Ligand binder design. Structure first.
Ligand SMILES: Nc1nc(=O)c2ncn([C@@H]3O[C@@H]4COP(=O)(O)O[C@H]5[C@@H](O)[C@H](n6cnc7c(N)ncnc76)O[C@@H]5COP(=O)(O)O[C@@H]3[C@@H]4O)c2[nH]1
Ligand SMILES: Nc1nc(=O)c2ncn([C@@H]3O[C@@H]4COP(=O)(O)O[C@H]5[C@@H](O)[C@H](n6cnc7c(N)ncnc76)O[C@@H]5COP(=O)(O)O[C@@H]3[C@@H]4O)c2[nH]1
Ligand SMILES: [Zn+2]
Ligand SMILES: [Zn+2]
Lengths: 361, 362
């Protein structure tokens, strides 16, 4: 049963796609950002959110993807809750427009996400050619994506995600109030210092139906989420140099590789993404706060505990958003029962047979 | 010992603890320094970066402190006049300078000047560096002999980077490296041919002669080819790959380098030794032991001891030839004196018998 340790060791693909193949992807990025803070464009104050992808972190789960956020601070913005999702909002301007080039993107009173993204893409889709240094290309604007992905073809088929995000330094939305329950895990001292940080809105189309197509934004917690990924232990020295290790990131990497390899053969699992796993292991980390329950010498037990948690999540159709309690990710609106019962069958099959899907020599 | 060589390599992840962020900052500053250094009216307009690996410079000499980067400028048809009989030191003489060349004014007669060329380079880098905006990056005073242009990248504390200028010549390799790189029975004659149809480089480092004229001596560097050997270190192409087996080659290299640093950082008496003595000794060791099976991760305790016994051999026998230049003996009597070679012999032998107590840093 100590073969998982050999899956984890084989998982690392160091330089290929992460080390020398990730500090090149950075180099392209800051070129774009610098040059993107050029002229008199609405985005002259665009900035790269402090996040972790390039620093050997895109390499843990879902290695075939790259991601970056371009934040852009806004003024006093009123948030109109979009129906009852708790995550999709309608961005308005608190006090009447005076000094902001973001009035070019106003559809009525609300800030339209398509007009802004449609023009965002046009600038980036114009300044990547303005440099010849490497072979970088951009993807098509497909529905659902609030990103402008750069398929660069230096390292196989890379696709660095550029995600425009609205930064609001005000208090967090009221739908995230009972969320982030890290009191008994990380502490009320850590939880408070994270909620006084700005929250971000990504231009995701809430496709509820007939109402606003591209005027809806979504709450992004990628900044807070990686503060939890690197600071996951109850001891501050967890997985540090002068500290003890744990199997939290490894039990995260194994569930991502399990769901990633399952979706490659079944297109009926096109309803589950890596964020279902992320949020699942957050509920499991909060349930088991002590680092003793995640000792590296219990990788098979901790992974089986996480698998039985994801099976109960599917089984009862209840995987609440870690920051937004009322927002249930495994709602029947979003995922039909048949997919839950289909994915339960494969995860159980791989769990009862020594994980044959990880059979890589 | 109680199999603690693997727990030392795992703690050598300190890279991540403190050099991850700094490596992006070095990447991001050099790049803005390089692209801003591609401006007109600068003889280095056509300068580039020689890709000699990455910032996680732990692969070579895993040092948790300072760094190095190399700049390559392509020159036209050099005539390498060997500096007397070094093998590594030359004089860059020019045959016909093609009209329109930016290296015309760096000659002190028939011979190219490393002292001059390294003057405007430092000069231009001093200019450009302070026009970089929100970042506090200044340059140090030029320490003597030292042929680089170290950069002080003020942020969290200190961040040094040696900006090493190096001429690129896509021509032929000198005669002194004609029997060097003996990878014929390890990496193959089919890859040694390709690695030598690749350019060679020259760094502005003066030789130590109280006589003749050592102001403009250039030195051979093979850091571009040394890198390939590190990442392509096995007889089997799938060594340390996804669909292959692992090996303790680079494993031993980090151990051997951290052993010498901690020893160097303990006594100044070991100041004559550098990280290139253990990279070169492991090149001969990988050539002597070519099979992947001879470097098995389950035999890390013995594969490292065997590397120790080979390195001490090179000390007590005073023989450690430059891997690309058979003539140049790095452990010669004129480079390092017997007194320092016996000192390191007792210190390494001391650690080897007592289970390496110098690695005790939990
Ligand atoms: N860096 C970043 N921060 C974000 O907030 C974000 N939100 C979306 N994306 C990227 O946009 C696309 C989302 O479309 P899709 O729904 O079909 O699948 C997505 C999406 O449904 C879901 N998802 C990802 N991040 C979030 C998030 N932060 N909150 C809710 N759902 C998310 O998981 C899938 C893949 O996520 P990523 O691998 O992070 O990159 C996604 C992807 O490019 C984001 N990228
Ligand atoms: N990237 C790079 N390629 C070079 O050829 C090179 N040559 C010198 N340097 C750097 O210049 C200084 C050398 O002065 P010192 O002799 O006291 O110690 C040097 C020098 O004695 C020795 N050396 C000899 N040949 C090489 C070589 N081909 N590559 C690296 N180091 C070499 O190595 C020692 C330091 O190693 P580095 O860690 O690579 O960085 C050095 C350092 O900043 C180089 N840096
Ligand atoms: Zn940990
Ligand atoms: Zn190998």
């Amino acid at each position: 049963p100590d073969k998982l340790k050999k899956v984890l060791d084989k998982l690392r693909l160091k330089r290929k796609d992460i080390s020398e193949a990730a500090e090149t992807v950075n180099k392209v990025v800051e070129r774009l950002l610098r040059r993107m803070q050029k002229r008199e464009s609405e985005f002259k104050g665009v900035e790269q959110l402090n996040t972790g992808s390039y620093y050997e972190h895109v390499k843990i789960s879902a290695p075939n993807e790259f991601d970056v956020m371009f934040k852009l601070e806004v003024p006093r913005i009123e948030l109109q809750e979009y129906y009852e999702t708790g995550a999709f909002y309608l961005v308005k301007f608190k006090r009447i427009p005076r000094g902001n080039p973001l009035s070019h993107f106003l559809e009525g009173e609300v800030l339209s996400a398509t007009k802004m993204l449609s023009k965002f893409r046009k600038i980036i889709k114009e300044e990547v050619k303005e440099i010849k240094d490497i072979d970088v290309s951009v993807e098509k604007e497909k529905p659902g994506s609030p990103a402008v992905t750069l398929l660069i073809r230096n390292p196989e088929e890379i696709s660095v995600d550029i995600i425009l995000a609205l930064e609001s330094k005000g208090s967090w939305p009221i739908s995230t109030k009972e969320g982030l329950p890290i009191q008994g895990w990380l502490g009320t001292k850590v939880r408070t210092n994270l909620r006084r940080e700005p929250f971000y809105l990504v231009p995701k189309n809430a496709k509820d139906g007939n109402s606003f197509q591209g005027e809806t934004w979504r709450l992004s917690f990628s900044h807070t989420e990686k503060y939890i990924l690197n600071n996951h232990g109850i001891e501050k020295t967890c997985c540090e140099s002068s500290g003890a290790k744990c199997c939290r990131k490894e039990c995260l990497k194994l569930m991502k590789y399990l769901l990633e390899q399952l979706k490659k053969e079944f297109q009926e699992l096109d309803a589950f993404c890596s964020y279902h796993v992320k949020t699942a292991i957050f509920h499991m980390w909060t349930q088991d706060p002590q680092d003793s329950q995640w000792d590296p010498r219990n990788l098979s037990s901790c992974f089986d505990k996480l698998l039985a948690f994801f099976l109960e999540c599917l089984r009862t159709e209840k995987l609440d958003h870690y920051f937004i309690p009322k927002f249930n990710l495994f709602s029947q609106e979003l995922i039909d029962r048949k997919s839950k019962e289909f994915l339960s069958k494969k995860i159980e099959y791989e769990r009862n047979n020594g994980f044959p899907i990880f059979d890589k020599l």
